Design a protein around this ligand. Structure first.
Ligand SMILES: Nc1nc2c(ncn2[C@@H]2O[C@@H]3COP(=O)(O)O[C@H]4[C@@H](O)[C@H](n5cnc6c(=O)[nH]c(N)nc65)O[C@@H]4COP(=O)(O)O[C@H]3[C@H]2O)c(=O)[nH]1
Ligand SMILES: Nc1ncnc2c1ncn2[C@@H]1O[C@H](COP(=O)(O)OP(=O)(O)NP(=O)(O)O)[C@@H](O)[C@H]1O
Ligand SMILES: [Mg+2]
Length: 177
């Protein structure tokens, strides 16, 4: 683990260019960068891997649209209340937000509980490993984060990563043990 202080906007915008090459015109990839984006502390290559795994899943999900499916990567500073509303119950203040959303078929309710399981997949035996989301989940937890999935059939799928805001001005947390 090589944690560093990262600007959330720079992280996604720089990576977006590389991601667009990976996706080609399989999807229309859109963005929505919020204003006054926070810094976070994380391993950069791990967050990139997590976003990449989500983005390729979104592409897979909207393949049947043959060029018309839409995948959005959204970033924001959320208020505590917005974060709770978007599915982070333990939000305690301003929160960093990364969300990969698509307009695909969504996740069947009977599948939802097992999507993060190592090796769970709906693809045939020769394609992939079924670790994409297990890796994402692990990365989010290693980054002291929370992930929430919002999806119903006919509602697309949104994978929402909530990370602590890092503030360089914050006083050192400390205690007398
Ligand atoms: N030794 C070892 N311990 C492990 C491992 N994976 C998890 N744990 C520990 O197992 C506890 C229970 O995990 P859970 O059943 O997923 O139960 C979780 C899960 O239901 C939920 N949860 C935690 N983080 C997230 C998240 O980011 N998104 C969602 N949707 N649920 C979450 O909150 C519950 C409590 O989470 P924690 O307080 O982190 O408590 C975790 C953690 O202390 C492992 O590989 N090795
Ligand atoms: N955006 C999405 N929309 C609908 N279903 C999804 C989405 N993302 C993940 N899933 C489901 O969750 C499963 C697990 O995803 P994942 O863990 O990435 O494995 P995988 O994509 O099947 N193979 P791989 O990522 O190559 O290892 C997928 O096979 C889908 O059934
Ligand atoms: Mg995958």
């Amino acid at each position: 683990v090589q944690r560093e202080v990262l600007d959330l906007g720079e992280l996604i915008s720089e990576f977006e260019v590389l991601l667009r090459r990976l996706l080609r015109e399989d999807v229309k990839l859109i963005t929505d960068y919020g204003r006054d984006l926070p810094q976070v502390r994380a391993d950069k290559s791990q967050l990139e891997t997590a976003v990449m795994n989500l983005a390729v899943n979104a592409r897979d999900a909207v393949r049947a649209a043959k060029g018309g499916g839409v995948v959005r990567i959204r970033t924001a500073r959320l208020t505590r209340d917005e974060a709770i509303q978007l599915g982070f119950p333990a939000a305690d203040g301003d929160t960093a937000f990364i969300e990969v959303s698509d307009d695909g078929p969504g996740i069947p309710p009977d599948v939802m509980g097992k999507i993060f399981d190592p090796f769970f997949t709906t693809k045939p035996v020769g394609e992939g490993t079924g670790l994409g989301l297990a890796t994402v989940y692990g990365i989010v937890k290693q980054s002291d984060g929370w992930i929430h999935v919002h999806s119903r059939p006919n509602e697309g799928a949104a994978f929402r990563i909530f990370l602590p805001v890092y503030e360089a001005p914050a006083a050192l947390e400390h205690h007398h043990h």
